[PDB]
Design a protein around this ligand. Sequence first.
Ligand SMILES: CC(C)(C)S(=O)(=O)N[C@@H](Cc1ccccc1)C(=O)N[C@@H](Cc1c[nH]c[nH+]1)C(=O)N[C@@H](CC1CCCCC1)C(O)(O)C(F)(F)C(=O)NCCN1CCOCC1
Length: 329
Amino acid sequence: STGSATTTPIDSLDDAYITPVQIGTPAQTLNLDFDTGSSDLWVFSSETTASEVXQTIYTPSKSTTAKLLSGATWSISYGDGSSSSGDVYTDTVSVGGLTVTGQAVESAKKVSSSFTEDSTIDGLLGLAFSTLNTVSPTQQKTFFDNAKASLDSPVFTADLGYHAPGTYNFGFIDTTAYTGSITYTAVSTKQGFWEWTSTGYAVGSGTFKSTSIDGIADTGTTLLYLPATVVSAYWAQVSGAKSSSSVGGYVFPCSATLPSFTFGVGSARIVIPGDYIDFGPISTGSSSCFGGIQSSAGIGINIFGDVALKAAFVVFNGATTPTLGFASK
Ligand SMILES: CC(C)(C)S(=O)(=O)N[C@@H](Cc1ccccc1)C(=O)N[C@@H](Cc1c[nH]c[nH+]1)C(=O)N[C@@H](CC1CCCCC1)C(O)(O)C(F)(F)C(=O)NCCN1CCOCC1
């Protein structure tokens, strides 16, 4: 089997991307943030404290296929400080026409304020490795892990758009969605992520520096977070750019024509166009824009988030020894 679903930016800044997910019988359609940096499928629900709901909710008692997973609970927090917790059902879940039975659906009893505040995100669908799942006492498998037995190939692909709709595919590689060929690189699962080592980088039309960059492919992070020295080298080529203590990163004049940023995948190169690195105005109508490449020093891990991923066609190869593929597009 295969599935193919459209993923859409939630706002004008490409802050996040949502993808429809059908849960239960009859199907309840929720828009979830597909997140290759975590491993829980959790939803706003009829269980969620009412004052914390502003979203479409899952009601397990309206689904004939929902089963309570007795004794199971979950609690998660994210790098940006947000959190949620609750209890666990198994139910039928479909993405893009691909159906899994027995998927753990983590029903939120409570959600943090940033979740309440974002009307567009009805929950998360984690796509990192199942070892990061937060259900206790027994961790639960991701949607991808449960799908692998039936998929035509144990893969999924991310084709995120720049201010445009894009696609998540499960079980096949669409050869018409990219140019050139895919280059694969090794993945370490020791921290539960799609963690890999980039072979280096270049700024604009300058030289490629072969300094290894260990980081994670994370569709649930907006920006590209790289080592301080790399980020400094990038913004050195932007004459109005400076680090802003108060705003929380590099800011630059919105009228700048930004250089591209190239990262290495083995011998291959993925080029992020300059305008992808313009995240957007600090506030509507500002003359200052926030950079899309920021230092990873505060977060402690390099993150190839959406600014990077949306420049590529990305293959998450979940064979027993997983790998990550990148192609230009
Ligand atoms: C506006 C912004 C200044 C650019 S922002 O950083 O706040 N944008 C958010 C995404 C967002 C956009 C719009 C609406 C709501 C949320 C962002 O990029 N958050 C990252 C920031 C980050 C990463 N690292 C340090 N900081 C994040 O937490 N991403 C997680 C998923 C997000 C959470 C908020 C809701 C949307 C999904 C994440 O899962 O990708 C993660 F990898 F960063 C992470 O937190 N992974 C958790 C892994 N744990 C390990 C232990 O086992 C449990 C799982």
